[PDB]
Amino acid sequence: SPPPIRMGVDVPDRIAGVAYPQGTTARRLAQIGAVVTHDGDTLTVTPPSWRPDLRQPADLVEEVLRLEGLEVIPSVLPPAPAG
């Protein structure tokens, strides 16, 4: 097993800009084969042996987002900086 990865339970929600139903991140990361444990609002995720590409939280975020589907991410123009 690779080293474990720690990330906040709502990190995929923030990156995607979507409030996923509760348990979505934990369910999806287990679905792809990782061991997921809870410590407050922080998940400790140990990827499976066949997923050496999962090394940091950003990798985990892609798994949740692609399985939930990118079509649920809304189109929200960010505010204009004072260019």
Q: Which residues are annotated as a binding site?
A: 53, 59, 62-63
- Is residue 80 part of the contact set for a copy of itself (CB under 8 A)? yes
| Residues 2, 52 contacting (CB under 8 angstroms) | yes
CA distance 83 to 75: 22
Residue 77 interface partner, choices Mg ion, a copy of itself, none, CB cut-off 5-8 Å depending on type: a copy of itself
Neighbours of 9 (CB within 10 A): 18
Among 8, 16, 62, 75, binds Mg ion (CB under 5 A): 62
Residue 70 interface partner, choices a copy of itself, Mg ion, none, CB cut-off 5-8 Å depending on type: none
| Residues 63, 32 contacting (CB under 8 angstroms) | yes
Interacting residues with a copy of itself between 40 and 79 (CB under 8 A):
77-79
Annotated binding site for Mg(2+): 53, 59, 62-63
- Is residue 13 part of the contact set for Mg ion (CB under 5 A)? no
Which of 15, 6, 76 is CA-nearest to residue 41?
6
